[PDB]
């Protein structure tokens, strides 16, 4: 934790990784920095392809204006699309707003692949997030680079035996999207290994990346913040900083 932040071994590993990425063209293709956390015991939670948001108090990873954003909505799509286009808060926020049925009708196969090429961030209504794996294809879902997030757009609460009225709240939408872009995410798995993106090579400094790593450690290991946090059991044996192609460089060896 605090020793993991204050250890000069982690900082030296970060300069070593940056220099290796600069020198090696294969690593120069990579642009993202991941940490590999060795949880002491098995996590015991099945993977469900649902990203869980890890807050970053000190710095922001991305701004929503920087990314290309695809919104996937439930399909009386006119209300959501018209509200988000007309409202000035979310007018330029989304690169494309589509419904799940229209997405299934339009994009197939190689068209889906060029969609994945075009769009960097995918967010969707939580009501259609479970339908997304068949529509988006498997080549979105493998690797967890661009897993679609879950946003709730109406702010109303579903009650048993009663309908839920459909509205769109652009302030709530931009708040959730800002949180998603500024904060990092993790997906639980069954075994001990975990992978969390902590920083981007060009846009982040080394103390910023180290502070993001420290915040990630505290959020995951903290007994509170259940159920989004507190998933690591038995402590962290070792963390390994690496890009997509680079080898793992160990920090916080216990």
């Amino acid at each position: 934790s605090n020793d993991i932040i204050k250890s000069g071994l982690a900082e030296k590993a970060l300069k070593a990784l940056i220099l290796q990425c600069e020198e090696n063209p294969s690593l120069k293709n990579d642009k993202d920095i991941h940490i590999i956390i060795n949880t002491g015991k098995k996590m015991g939670i099945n993977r469900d392809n649902i990203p869980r948001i890890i807050p970053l108090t000190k710095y922001k990873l991305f701004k929503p204006r920087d990314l290309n954003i695809l919104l996937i909505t439930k399909d009386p799509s006119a209300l959501y699309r018209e509200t988000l286009t007309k409202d000035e808060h979310t007018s330029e926020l989304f690169k494309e707003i589509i419904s799940v049925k229209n997405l299934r009708r339009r994009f197939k196969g190689s068209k889906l692949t060029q969609l994945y090429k075009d769009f960097d961030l995918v967010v969707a209504d939580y009501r259609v997030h479970h339908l997304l794996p068949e529509v988006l294809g498997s080549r979105f879902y493998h690797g967890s680079k661009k897993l679609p997030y879950m946003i709730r757009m109406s702010k109303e609460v579903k009650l048993k035996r009663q309908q839920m009225v459909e509205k769109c709240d652009p302030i709530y939408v931009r708040a959730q999207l800002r949180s998603i872009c500024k904060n990092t995410s993790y997906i639980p798995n069954n075994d001990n290994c975990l992978s969390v993106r902590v920083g981007y090579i060009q846009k982040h400094s080394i103390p910023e990346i180290l502070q993001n790593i420290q915040d990630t450690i505290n959020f995951l290991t903290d007994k509170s913040k259940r159920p989004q946090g507190g998933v690591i059991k038995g402590g962290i044996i070792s963390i390994f900083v690496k890009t997509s192609n680079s080898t793992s460089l160990p920090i916080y060896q216990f």
Binding site: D48, I50, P51, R52, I53, P55, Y126, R127, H129, H130, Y149, M150, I151, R152, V157, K158, K160, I171, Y172, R174, A175, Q176, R178, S179, I180, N183, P227, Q228
Partner: peptide
């Protein structure tokens, strides 16, 4: 906290909202 009885995954999948997020900037 929120709960949808149809969709249990909303509670982990929900992004936390803050006053800095609900701000004009």
């Amino acid at each position: 906290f929120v709960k949808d009885h149809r969709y249990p995954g909303l509670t982990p999948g929900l992004a936390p909202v803050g006053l800095s997020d609900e701000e004009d900037s």
